[PDB]
């Protein structure tokens, strides 16, 4: 899977903030080293309190989870 979908999710001051970047890769079982900053961002002025995370996945796959 050459496609890497790197996202960042954050809630500050009552808005949901997102980041994204699509970049080709070579390894799928581990994240390769390298630098590529995530310029895109969209602000969602919702005000929703969020403390729990559930991955929404389509069922008729692997992913990583980090913490800031």
């Amino acid at each position: 899977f050459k496609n890497l979908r790197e996202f960042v999710f954050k809630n500050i001051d009552g808005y949901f903030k997102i980041y994204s970047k699509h970049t080709p890769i070579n390894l799928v079982r581990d994240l390769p080293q390298g630098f590529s900053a995530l310029e895109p961002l969209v602000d969602l002025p919702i005000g929703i309190n969020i403390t729990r995370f559930q991955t929404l996945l389509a069922l008729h796959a692997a992913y990583y989870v980090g913490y800031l």
Partner: protein, 49 residues
């Protein structure tokens, strides 16, 4: 008019008074305030900058 801690979204459009160059005028913008000289520059701005 409901305002939240998040950045506001329902804004009010103005008249973006015509712009001039090479003379000291107020350069007040959507987020900037002050006076100065506005010339033409060829910086490589990013789409989100």
């Amino acid at each position: 008019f409901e305002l939240l801690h998040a950045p506001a979204t329902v804004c009010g459009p103005k008249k973006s008074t015509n712009l001039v160059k090479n003379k000291c005028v107020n350069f007040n913008f959507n987020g900037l305030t002050g006076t100065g000289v506005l010339t033409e520059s060829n910086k490589k701005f990013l789409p989100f900058q």
